[PDB]
Design an enzyme around this catalytic site. Structure first.
Site, PDB file in Angstrom:
ATOM      1  NE  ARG A 277      -0.068  -0.132   4.985  1.00  0.00           N
ATOM      2  CZ  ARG A 277       0.818   0.714   5.503  1.00  0.00           C
ATOM      3  NH1 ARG A 277       1.055   1.883   4.920  1.00  0.00           N
ATOM      4  NH2 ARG A 277       1.476   0.385   6.604  1.00  0.00           N
TER       5      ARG A 277
ATOM      6  NE  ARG B 186       4.632   8.822  10.444  1.00  0.00           N
ATOM      7  CZ  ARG B 186       4.192   7.572  10.339  1.00  0.00           C
ATOM      8  NH1 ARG B 186       3.276   7.111  11.179  1.00  0.00           N
ATOM      9  NH2 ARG B 186       4.673   6.781   9.390  1.00  0.00           N
TER      10      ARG B 186
END
EC number: 6.3.4.14
Lengths: 443, 80, 425, 77, 427, 423, 78, 77
Positions: free
Chosen positions: E273, E319
């Site tokens: 993915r 992040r």
């Protein structure tokens, strides 16, 4: 009705007057500094006029600019508000002389009460209780001096004429020698051995009386307010009525203030500030203008003092009669300032998030909003929270919750301080004196 | 934002209490002053600018120490 | 006092109850749907309890969940508010037997006034004027039907379970059926009452709530224009004794239609109402605090002689809806500012950044303005509405402004059909 | 990372009865339909079952502690 | 290409896919939970469909709801994103069976690499280097066991986790049921390789990324390329990965995660993915990985052949999570004030805005800050400034933590291992 | 490096310079008017100094105030930005005279290129192609004038427009002749010179989309420009830099018609639209300005300058999108676009008030893409994402322009935008 | 609004079982718990949405052939 | 370009006297100190002078119209 007025002020009081004008259908002209383009009342006004740069001296104290604005907009009257030019006799003079109505008292009256000496003179002549004194220096006759101290009531204070040489006396036996020693000290210090005597008010409370006079012979008093909670002689919390004041005492001081209004031919709204000790009043000053803390009086009497100012300026006589003025409930007011709550350092800056408290008996008076910047000029008071209640305890509880609801981020405020004061047990008892707040925060 | 009449700086520069390093200050707290009287100096690019009082009264406070920089509209002195 | 209560509601009324509680030092427990985590009253409450998903049927109408919240938090009482479960006899029952105080009337009383027929029975029994009707279905005998119409007085109306203005048009106009008096252009006038359930009961003047859309109140005011103190005393006294008769407890409202100086009972709201604040403005009585005081077992502190009507108050309901099509208008409020000033009272949970979810009634706030007289109240309302800022969603604010500018509203006494006649509905 | 949340308000319990063993413990595998815990509401002993098979990573609530709707009870993988 | 697709995800990745689609003129269908009505990408989408209540299991993991949504909107394809159902073989199957294109790899491939055992099997078969081990349990023969430790090379690790660093006490270490042996990689770096395969025989690698900075095995900072990795080493491991793609018949974008120590790579897992940290790769290659996913799903072969893949500059990504920066407890709530950083080489990837509430569901990552630079130092400096500019009030964030990391001298040197961040914070 | 500098500007360019400074470890001093206390760069700066009241003439054009600020803060250099005093030879002079570094070219260079006559002259000498003209007046001989119109080439302009010989005679009635470029494109060349003999060119930019001679949209590279043509004009520009002893960043603006360039002006300063050049070359022009001012020679060789991809820039202005009336006021809600290749350059934020002074440009949106088409689509999306409420903006106009088919094909002239809006 | 029966799934709304069949309900019609009010086609399953509370149908918020999402208001009662 | 703003509140006038010619017109050259217009406040006719030399681009206010502090009056090129 006044066709159109200039609001010669800014911030919360400017918004207050503007609201009054809208309710009476009076056209508004907001004059503002270049730094106050974003003021709520400016954004709401019918016409706006920039009158100068940020500094007060070049904008809101700029007499030529304000009057000029009045002419170009075609206003009929000018509302000065509080502070700035509200008690500037010269300003009132040029306003009337330029053909505009000054929403306030006559210039002559402002000068009269603007000077300590002439003000005192008028009040005594009118029967308003002032601070008892020897009425002139003292002689060598100790029987006379003691008679004066007895009349006035101990304790008393001896002060020097020259300019020190000051001394409090609490009993008869020590008066004579207290005068001698203070007269010697006055001669070795101020080069003059002249002294006089006054009543010494050790624990007074700031109690003030609201009044309205149409300048046509009518005058009423609207109960009193206690504004004892102070820092550096600046009011922090006000309330109405004043705890401990019976309706008969209220009627005592009130009627005398009203007659005084009639005597000096007062016009508009005014306030008689007094020191209050052991059930006695002692005149300090008369604010010949609307005051910051007028809202608490509005809450307990239902009278809109600003609308009354406007009606009186339009030439209308008092619609309200003394008999119809009733004290109902209780109201407290915390001044919200943009300042560090511990160092009282001004805190200008952008307000990043704001939410006003609401609910039964809650009244928020402020021009601030989310995104509005408090400029680094002008007084630091940015709002006023006023809570009403069936009684004093309910008013205070309402104030606690409301302060807890009040959100003002981006700048420091004194909100937390106000919370402490509401939690103060001595304040909850009521009747704290004019020294208490600083007596509490550590001298 | 401090209350009282505030004489602000009309220029960017360095603030000084005295006309010269060894001299006495133009004013002191508690002193009476008249319109036009020199309260201090703001030195900017070799110009020794004397900032004068625009209102008469007594000096309440002096908000800046000597040798410290000042910006436009910076509060310098408070009067009566 | 009450140590701790659950506020079994949401939005503005939930915030109203919360404030009442904080002032009395009562600990609060806000039960909320998963979609109401951002509610102000939820953010301010001392304890919070999620009771279900967004839909009302799964959250605020979820009896087991609410009682369970009361149990685990250790609350002593539950305030239902208005709507939802406030007039649900079953709910009140389980609340009481589970050992909690239901801040409201007895379940028996809710059932009594919860049924049209039994409610009417009680009112007549108490002497409260009701709507004249056939009192039972109608037959085929036209002599009887005409006699009944005569008693009631024309015009009349036929209902199932057509308007007739004359005898000639009765026959054809008449499946179980019944007949009532037809009040063509009446005003909605309701009377506020408080009863301690200990024999004492007082009335707090009246309210006019004629401005309506689909039988939904848009504007309320107190007192009601045209109502004399003698008329107020008449209907008010009857309502109070009725409270004594049915043994009512808590706050309640007797709604009446008012035509040609006569009152006609329609329903009794056995709960606090939305528009209660207008009564508070003119009487000074805190109705919510009185609810809590009565539930705590205290007798009425206010005795009838002490109830005085002073000034006038108006209330505009602020709804999240298209002001022209009345389509619900959920979405994020991007900018908000509340009006202020003398006599201005803002009752709302909304704030900048808060999202109005696509569930629940569309009322997001209430603006109430008080004044020395009706004209001052209305002018205050105009200004306040103009100050009120709510962006991100459509609201009925503009509509409310129109209504305040309406000349017939300024005259006062507009009927319950006027608003829809004005909007062309 | 799968979170079994409470479908109701009540008091959380690890066991079917006060002195019986807990339905589950960390590291134990469970299947869909298996009872993981109990939520007492109004004297009713509601059995909360697993909606996904895997191993119990964590147990987020202690016995006797209250829980709300959609409150995380168990972490599974 | 694809007329209309469903974005089977939420938050920042959903916004990223939406932008990709908008640029390609592809109509978007945002499926969302009831708690995500306010998502930016939902507000921007051409069509919206609520698929369930807040919990992911009843919304973003609700296969029947997602497919039906595709059906009523008439979408042709579905993009799963990362997490949720992106690596769910059954989901891909049902998508295809309903006549929709699954923007991702073949279901058989998902299961293959989704299982530890089968994944390893494929990698060895393809020549991808894995972790050396005993290849079977061990007996009582200490001569044998020592020979095995020798082959593997000390230190070694014992599993049924106990470390042996020398011959002398291997014997006792076996004491502490049946046991295997592996090489003990004490101070490795997380280095992963990006790949694209059209499922038509073509496969390329797009350099690597270093994701060593971690808390409890969760990535906090990523960068590309990885410091210390030579072009020859890059070519070695990269080519190995591409060949693996061709062998297993991979399709779409994927990533081969490796541990890296003293010039050796050791396969751990293949993410079948798109990954969270894909943007740092995009910055240094100029390749739009999302658009490439869409083109491959549309049946197009790779437009880029390996020779055309060039590494330029350096990119870092911090992040941004809604959590307490010291106790790392999720921190849902309303964002009271927001301002995004800007400037040359600054790329902000987030759906958050002033007034938006971070719901008490789903992963805590609310944004990603990615800074590009001509070199590693310029990238880091930009990251410092941008983080300092970043404003997020109303909820706690790990922004301050990210600042410390950028100021960390060992990070500035580069090459920190997978234990460093936790070593520094004392956990 | 520079220890500390004064950013003698405001708004977006001031924020841009500040970022450059932070990356290089340069201490920043934000000088601001009394009305710009809330500027983002001011709030981010290390030191602040109010230099005067709102009006530009008393603040950002106040030379004594700015230099004085540099002195009291102890800055070594002053960055003028664009506009205001950036091309004020006198300002640069006084800065150098007070002992500070002027982050820009030498004052004599500013004057040289600040006057049309001398600037053109320098260009002649340096080999930069200028507008063909009679090069001095002519008298009686009409044979000469007609021959001159032919060589110089029709249409021509006097000192007005002549398209033929028959229309020359009447039009001539000191005089001179120039080439008339009717439908040209604004094409400009970016340059950097260290003032030590080195000078490079960084491709070009097309800035044809204009209203009232004001740029609305810019892009790089310029459509239709071959690398060989680019090298032609670029190398000549570099040589010009060496000749006039240029220092810092600069731009040579040209009118471009039928494959030919015609010098208009040299902007001796950084320009608004510099970011599009940065996107396609990877060069940080501001950081290069600062390095050159620090006395460093060009680190980059012409050979190392490569054009990759394409970039477009829409100027975001606070104005009515239909009447272009200035639009000061408070921004009630703001959200910036994001994503791959998206670059937002603005100081505005929710709650920030745009004062009723200064230029109306409040931001710049710049989108990069592997090719022109991708850049444009990206720009559309980003504009659609951009939220600015509370004030009027030209966002909708920019959207229209991105949707314009003639713009999408490329090569529109400097008259097109006004041709499109019917003015 | 009144009491809202919402959709529990994504699908297509239908008023009748067939084009030429009777509508399950119309405005003014009374219904009790369990009664079919409408249909939402999801997958090969033709789901019948029934009333969860008794009363009279106030409104029908969706037309036949139009798609509906989770929790979408379909019918109002009382 | 350069904006000469009003330094005071008053009424704007182009001429020194009702039947006299305007101080300036568009296109005219002016030097620092030159009178461009008048702002009357309380019967005093204050002369507003140019603070920069150049040519008039525009005159932004009509005679007899009111002006506030810092209001744009004239632009010079």
């Amino acid at each position: 009705m006044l066709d159109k007025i200039v609001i010669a002020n800014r911030g919360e009081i400017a918004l207050r007057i503007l609201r009054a004008c809208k309710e009476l259908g009076i056209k508004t002209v907001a004059v503002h500094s270049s730094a106050d383009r974003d003021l709520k009342h400016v954004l709401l006004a019918d016409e706006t006029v920039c009158i100068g740069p940020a500094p007060s001296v070049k904008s809101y104290l700029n007499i030529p600019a304000i009057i000029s604005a009045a002419e170009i907009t075609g206003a009929v009257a000018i509302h000065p508000g509080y502070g700035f030019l509200s008690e500037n006799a010269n300003f009132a003079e040029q306003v009337e002389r330029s053909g505009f109505i000054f929403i306030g008292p006559k210039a002559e009256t402002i000068r009269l009460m603007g000077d300590k000496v002439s003000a005192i003179a008028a009040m005594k002549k009118a029967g308003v209780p002032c601070v008892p004194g020897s009425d002139g220096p003292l002689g060598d006759d100790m029987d006379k001096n003691r008679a004066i101290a007895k009349r006035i009531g101990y304790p008393v204070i001896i002060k020097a004429s020259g300019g020190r040489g000051m001394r409090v006396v609490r009993g008869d036996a020590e008066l004579a020698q207290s005068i001698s020693m203070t007269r010697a000290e006055a001669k070795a210090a101020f080069s003059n051995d002249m002294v006089y005597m006054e009543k010494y008010l050790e624990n007074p409370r700031h109690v003030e009386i609201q009044v309205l006079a149409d300048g046509q012979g009518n005058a009423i008093y609207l109960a009193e307010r206690d504004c004892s909670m102070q820092r550096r002689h600046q009011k922090v919390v006000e309330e109405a009525p004043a705890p401990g004041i019976t309706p008969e005492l209220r009627r005592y001081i009130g009627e005398r203030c009203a007659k005084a209004c009639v005597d000096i031919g007062y016009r508009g709204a005014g306030t008689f500030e007094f020191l209050f000790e052991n059930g006695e009043f002692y005149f300090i000053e008369m604010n010949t203008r609307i005051q910051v803390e007028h809202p608490v009086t509005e809450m307990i009497t239902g009278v809109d003092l600003i609308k009354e100012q406007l009606r009186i300026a339009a030439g209308q006589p008092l619609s309200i009669k003394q008999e119809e003025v009733h004290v109902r409930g209780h109201a407290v007011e915390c001044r919200i300032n943009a300042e560090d709550p511990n160092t009282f350092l001004p805190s200008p800056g952008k307000i990043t998030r704001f939410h006003a408290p609401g609910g039964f008996g809650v009244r928020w008076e402020s021009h601030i909003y989310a995104g509005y910047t408090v400029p680094p000029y002008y007084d630091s008071m940015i709002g006023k929270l006023i809570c009403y209640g069936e009684n004093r305890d309910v008013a205070i509880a309402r104030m606690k919750n409301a302060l807890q609801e009040l959100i003002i981020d981006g700048i420091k405020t004194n909100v937390d301080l106000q919370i402490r004061i509401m939690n103060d047990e001595n304040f909850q008892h009521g009747g704290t004196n004019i020294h208490y707040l600083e007596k509490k925060l550590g001298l | 934002e401090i209350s009282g009449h505030i004489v602000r700086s009309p220029m960017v520069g360095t603030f000084y209490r005295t006309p010269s390093p060894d001299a006495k200050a133009f004013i002191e707290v508690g002193q009476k002053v008249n319109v036009g009287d020199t309260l201090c100096i703001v030195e900017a690019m070799k110009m020794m600018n004397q900032i004068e009082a625009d209102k008469s009264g007594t000096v309440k406070a002096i908000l800046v120490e000597s040798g410290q920089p000042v910006e436009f509209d910076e509060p310098l002195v408070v009067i009566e």
